[PDB]
C-alpha cells in the first residue's frame, strides 16, 4: 500500500506561461507511473506516463518528469481548455492493480 | 491550393510521404509534378486568444486519395451509436483545434503553405511569360525578330 | 487524442526479462487490431507481433515463442510480455493500430528504446 500525495491542491497561473505540478510518493516508484486529466464531463484522459515520454500527437507543450519517489508533470503554455483535474496513477505491481491520488485542480485566471 | 498547417508537419507535404496530414487530411500524388511554398506565418495567423479557428483532421475512416477534399462534420466512433446517445466511449470528433498563440515555439508556428499543380493533359496552353522587349537597335545591319 | 504511447524502455542484463505496455485514449483497443513493430537503432523496421479483437495473436519469427501480447481491455491499454531478451532484441518498439485494406497503419508512438547491458 504505497500512499501518494499530490501538490498543490489548486493552482491559478496567468495565461501563456508554464505550469509545474508535483505528485509525491512514499516509496520507490522508479519510472512506473501515469497521469490522467479528467476534464469535467467525461472520462479521464491519460497525458504522460512513466518517467518523461511525451504522448503521441500530444503537443510538446506537455512534459512529465521525475523518478524514484518523486515525479512532476509540466505544461509549457496552457491554453484556455486545459483547465481540468489531474491524477498520477502508478502500477509497479500491475497484475490487476492501480492506485490513484487525491487529484489536483488546474485553472486559468 | 492554400492552407494552414502546424510548423512541425511541413515535412509531410512531399511525394508519397506518409503521416497524418498527408494520409487523412490532404494527400499529394506520388508522381505529382508542381511545387509547394511555405511561409512561417508567425505573425499573419496568430492571436494571444488562440488562432485555432482552423480545425485540422485527426479522425478519418480511410486513407486519402490524391486531392480529395474531405470537409465533414461527423463523429468517429467505435461501437454502435455516436455520443448523441452514448458518452465517454465512441464519442470522437475529427475536428481538432490548432491553438495558435504567440508563445508557441517555431515548430508550432502556423506556416502558410501554397501548392501549385500544373496539369498538362490536352494543353492549349494559355499561360506563359517570355515577352522579351529588347531596345530596338537602329541604323545597323541587325538581326530582328518582329512577332515571329 | 487518438494516440499510442509506450513505456517499459530501459536497461536489463541479457537473458533477463522486461514488459512493454501500450495505453490509448480517445480510441478503443479491445475492438481494434493492435500491432507491435520495432526498429533497431539505424536499421529498418520489422513487424514483431499482432493481437486481434478476439484475442488470436501472432508474432514475428525472430521473436516467436518468446513474447506474449495482452491487453487490459477494461481500461483501454495494451501489454507485451517479453522474456529472454538476447543480443538481437535491442531496438525501439512502436505501438500501432492497423486497419489494413481500409486505411493503413497511422497512429504511431514516439518509441522507447530497450537495450541490454551489452
Cell match 487490431: residue?
C33
**Is C110 near chain A, with CB under 8 Å?**
yes
Helix (H) or strand (E) holding A35: strand A35-38
Residue ranges in chain C assigned as alpha helix (H): none
Resolution (A): 3.4
Method: cryo-EM
Alpha carbons B101 and A108: distance in angstroms, whole number: 16
C96: chain B residues, CB-CB within 8 Å: none
What fold is seen in the domain C3-116?
Answer: Immunoglobulin-like (2.60.40)
Architecture of domain A5-108 in CATH?
Sandwich (2.60)
Among B99, B106, B107, which would you mutate to test the A interface (most chain A Cβ atoms within 10 Å of its Cβ)?
A: B99
Alpha carbons C96 and C107: distance in angstroms, whole number: 6
Question: CB–CB of C49/C80 below 8 Å?
Answer: yes
Q: How far is A6 from chain C (nearest CA, A)?
A: 22
Bridge-based pairing of strands A104-108 and A10-13 is parallel
CA C51, C53, C54: angle at the middle one, nearest 5?
A: 95
- Following CA atoms A30, C110, C21, C86 in sequence, which dihedral angle do they give, to the nearest 10 degrees? -90
Cβ distance of B78 and C31 shorter than 8 Å: yes
Of A57, A60, A77, the CB nearest to B103: A77
Alpha carbons B99 and B105: distance in angstroms, whole number: 12
Q: How far is B92 from chain C (nearest CA, A)?
A: 7
Of B60, B63, B89, the CB nearest to C28: B89
Q: What stretches of C1-118 adopt beta strand conformation (E)?
A: 3-7, 10-12, 18-25, 34-39, 45-51, 57-59, 68-70, 77-82, 91-97, 113-116
Other Cβ atoms closer than 10 A to B27: 23
B48: chain A residues, CB-CB within 8 Å: 15-16
Q: What stretches of A50-99 adopt beta strand conformation (E)?
A: 62-67, 70-75, 84-88
Amino acid at each position: 500500500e504505497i500512499v501518494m500525495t499530490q501538490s498543490p491542491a489548486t493552482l491559478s497561473v496567468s495565461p501563456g506561461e508554464r505550469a509545474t505540478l508535483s505528485c509525491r510518493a512514499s516509496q520507490s516508484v522508479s519510472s512506473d507511473l501515469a497521469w490522467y486529466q479528467q476534464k469535467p464531463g467525461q472520462a479521464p484522459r491519460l497525458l504522460i506516463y512513466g518517467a518523461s515520454t511525451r504522448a503521441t500527437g500530444i503537443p510538446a507543450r506537455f512534459s512529465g518528469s521525475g523518478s524514484g519517489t518523486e515525479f512532476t508533470l509540466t505544461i509549457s503554455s496552457l491554453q484556455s481548455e486545459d483547465s481540468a483535474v489531474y491524477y498520477c496513477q502508478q502500477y509497479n505491481n500491475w497484475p490487476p492493480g492501480y492506485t490513484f491520488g487525491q487529484g489536483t485542480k488546474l485553472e486559468i485566471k | 491550393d492554400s492552407f494552414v498547417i502546424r510548423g512541425n508537419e511541413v515535412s509531410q507535404i512531399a511525394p508519397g510521404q506518409t503521416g497524418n496530414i498527408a494520409d487523412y487530411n490532404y494527400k499529394l500524388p506520388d508522381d505529382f509534378t508542381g511545387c509547394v511554398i511555405a511561409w512561417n506565418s508567425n505573425k499573419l495567423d496568430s492571436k494571444v486568444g488562440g488562432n485555432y479557428n482552423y480545425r485540422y483532421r485527426l479522425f478519418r475512416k480511410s486513407n486519402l486519395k490524391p486531392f480529395e477534399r474531405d470537409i465533414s462534420t461527423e463523429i468517429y466512433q467505435a461501437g454502435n451509436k455516436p455520443c448523441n446517445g452514448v458518452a465517454g466511449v465512441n464519442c470522437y470528433f475529427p475536428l481538432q483545434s490548432y491553438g495558435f498563440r504567440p508563445t508557441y515555439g517555431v515548430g508550432h508556428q502556423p506556416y502558410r503553405v501554397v501548392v501549385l499543380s500544373f496539369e498538362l493533359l490536352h494543353a492549349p496552353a494559355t499561360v506563359c511569360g517570355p515577352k522579351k522587349s529588347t531596345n530596338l537597335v537602329k541604323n545597323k545591319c541587325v538581326n530582328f525578330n518582329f512577332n515571329g | 487524442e487518438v494516440q499510442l504511447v509506450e513505456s517499459g524502455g530501459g536497461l536489463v542484463q541479457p537473458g533477463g526479462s522486461l514488459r512493454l505496455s501500450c495505453a490509448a485514449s480517445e480510441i478503443t483497443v479491445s475492438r481494434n487490431y493492435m500491432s507491435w513493430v520495432r526498429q533497431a537503432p539505424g536499421k529498418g523496421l520489422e513487424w514483431v507481433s499482432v493481437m486481434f479483437a478476439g484475442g488470436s495473436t501472432f508474432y514475428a519469427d525472430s521473436v516467436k515463442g518468446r513474447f506474449t501480447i495482452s491487453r487490459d481491455n477494461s481500461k483501454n491499454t495494451l501489454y507485451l510480455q517479453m522474456n529472454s531478451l538476447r543480443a538481437e532484441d535491442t531496438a525501439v518498439y512502436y505501438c500501432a493500430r492497423d486497419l489494413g485494406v481500409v486505411g493503413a497503419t497511422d497512429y504511431w508512438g514516439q518509441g522507447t528504446l530497450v537495450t541490454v547491458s551489452s
